[PDB]
Amino acid sequence: VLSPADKTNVKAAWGKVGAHAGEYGAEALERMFLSFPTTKTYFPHFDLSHGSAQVKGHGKKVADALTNAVAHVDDMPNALSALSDLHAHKLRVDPVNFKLLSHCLLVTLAAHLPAEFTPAVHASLDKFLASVSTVLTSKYR
Amino acid sequence: VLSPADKTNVKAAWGKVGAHAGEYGAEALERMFLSFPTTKTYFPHFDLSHGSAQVKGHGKKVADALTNAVAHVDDMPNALSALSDLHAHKLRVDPVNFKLLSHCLLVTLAAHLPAEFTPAVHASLDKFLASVSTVLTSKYR
Amino acid sequence: VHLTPKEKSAVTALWGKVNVDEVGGEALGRLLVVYPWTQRFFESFGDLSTPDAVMGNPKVKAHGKKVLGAFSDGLAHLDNLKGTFATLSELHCDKLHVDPENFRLLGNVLVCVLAHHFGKEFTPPVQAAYQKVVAGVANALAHKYH
Amino acid sequence: VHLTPKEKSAVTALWGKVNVDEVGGEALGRLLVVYPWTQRFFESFGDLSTPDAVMGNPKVKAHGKKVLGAFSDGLAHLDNLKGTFATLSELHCDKLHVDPENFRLLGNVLVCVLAHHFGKEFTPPVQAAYQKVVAGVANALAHKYH
Ligand code: HEM
Ligand code: HEM
Ligand code: HEM
Ligand code: HEM
Secondary structure, eight states, X not given: OOOHHHHXXXXXXXXXXXXXXXXXXXXXXXXXXXXXXXXXXGOTTSOOSTTOHHHHHHHHHHHHHHHHHHHTTXXXXXXXXXXXXXXXXXXXXXXXXXXXXXXXXXXXXXXXXXXXXXXXXXXXXXXXXXXXXXXXXXXXX | OOOHHHHHHHHHHHHHHGGGHHHXXXXXXXXXXXXXXXXXXXXXXXXXXXXXXXXXXXXXXXXHHHHHHHHTTTSHHXXXXXXXXXXXXXXXXXXXXXXXXXXXXXXXXXXXXXTTOOHHHHHHHHHHHHHHHHXXXXXXX | XXXXXXXXXXXXXXXXXXXXXXXXXXXXXXHXXXXXXXXXXXXXXXXXXXXXXXXXXXXXXXXXXXXXXXXXXXXXXXXXXXXXXXXXXXXXXXXXXXXXXXXXXXXXXXXXXHHHHHGGGSOHHHHHHHHHHHHHHHHHHTGGGO | OOOOHHXXXXXXXXXXXXXXXXXXHHHHHHHHHHSGGGGXXXXXXXXXXXXXXXXXXXXXXXXXXXXXXXXXXXXTOTTOHXXXXXXXXXXXIIISOXXXXXHXXXXXXXXXXXXXXXXXXXXXXXXXXXXXXXXXXXXXXXXXXX
């Protein structure tokens, strides 16, 4: 469960991301594809090279979903229900892969927001991304 | 999330366990300790040998907790809140270990209830134990 | 992986009683049912819409038989699983890109199937021996990732 | 594990800039804060009640320094991590019984700390090279379980 302090920390850290939201999401995807090449197979219709417009565009989608989760942090299963259906049913994304993308999102935030990425905020962000991941993997049937 | 069919399957399978509830819980613990010896370190005040009264008694506690979860399957975070605090805060149980005990519970049920352990019921039981595990690991802070 | 003589005995004795035509298919079918994301790798197998559909699917039974053969092969070479599974590792890791967590999952489903079939004969010490084996196989199959 | 020359270059170049007195403690401290069950293994370290308490704890900084030394040792022997980490594997697996998932977690926390310290210099390809390294170290430390 996310504590009051966790929600405060995540909202504050994500507030600092700003107009870089889409950019950071795209960078997290790139980090994931390079570090964990098994994840690439989900995107055969994507060119996954650096500067790819498709990865850029997808990064914005990812970011917008996370922003929705932050904005509705007390109602995340509802807020992310459609996305949960998509990833679990249609796409059949392996649950391990959410841990990989979550790690790459943390690395991306650490690399861009040194003042915000305190140990306490790191812990809150990890819990938040784990919570998002729990919702997105909740619909396998 | 647990579907209506999942809840029906788990209630039916657990209904067949009966007066063997405590016994099966004790057997699952023994299976875990022998198969995954890292888990033994949580019980230094226990004699973990076969026929140990302490493992027998603890198996009944485990079983009674699972029975509570089955009986309150739509309200499990509330029902298991005290136990979540215990395992996460006080005992600091590694989240990996819940996957190990869940597997050993499935093996125990398979070994005792051949007619009930259909592929569909296996799937429902796995989801149920994963849900219990999610609640019991929800309180790390 | 190192099994004691007592464990080797327990494992080999049970394996001789295994129905090699059916157990592999039961394990693969249950993997597909219990962990539905694994169906992503088997779209050419046809009807996987229901548990009954999966378990009765001829391609699942046929492929399951091949998997069990590989486990049988591993049981004969417990002291050289890496060499034994080299080609399969290249296939599952380099060509298929299956996350290695799923090797562990299939191994644990196999252990559930053995428990189902053998009942009280699948004692806690027998299970512990089989857990060593399926862990060894999973690690060997994942070698190309290491 | 096999790094390309380009990856080896990227890894070695960054590591030379690492503050070896501090980074290990930052990684160990963050492990204890982010994954609080790991505190079970460090009850003799004293005050771990708050994040500030953990990060400022002299024993955490001191031990963290030893961990980083081991990673440094691994970077010098990428072609023989198993031998390099043999004694540490016996300690962490046979004596301490730490679940090996936590070796992976500490490695990933280290990668976060490197990203924190180096910023845009910790590029996606540099990260990918370091992920190979920390995976290799984790697997080598877990050898006694295999
Ligand atoms: C924090 C975790 C994640 C978030 C917030 C997220 C969010 C999203 C969003 C917003 C979309 C687009 C939905 C739409 O356009 O209707 C999407 C699609 C997709 N996601 Fe994710 N996702 C996450 C994790 C993952 C992971 C781990 C994988 C696989 C490794 C994955 C694979 C995909 C694929 C393949 C698509 C479809 C792309 C396409 O066909 O164009 N997602 N996701
Ligand atoms: C399905 C999962 C689990 C259930 C339902 C469960 C249930 C319980 C219950 C009912 C108790 C006794 C509570 C009390 O007496 O106040 C307990 C205690 C305990 N549990 Fe679990 N547990 C689970 C998983 C685990 C795992 C995976 C571990 C470690 C590997 C673990 C380690 C312990 C320990 C060390 C105690 C305290 C024993 C003592 O000090 O006497 N539990 N658990
Ligand atoms: C211990 C674990 C496993 C063993 C021993 C095993 C063994 C095998 C064997 C013997 C084959 C036949 C290779 C041949 O025809 O020469 C095969 C093929 C295949 N495996 Fe597995 N397997 C395991 C896990 C998995 C998992 C978990 C997945 C996916 C979730 C998977 C996906 C596949 C696919 C898609 C093929 C067909 C490849 C082709 O025909 O081109 N395997 N495996
Ligand atoms: C890549 C991962 C790791 C590396 C490289 C590493 C390295 C080390 C080193 C160099 C020592 C000092 C040994 C000595 O004094 O000779 C040590 C001790 C220790 N490690 Fe780690 N470690 C890792 C992961 C972990 C984790 C995840 C835990 C627990 C969650 C852990 C628990 C301990 C403990 C309790 C000691 C003290 C043992 C003693 O002094 O008797 N280690 N480790």
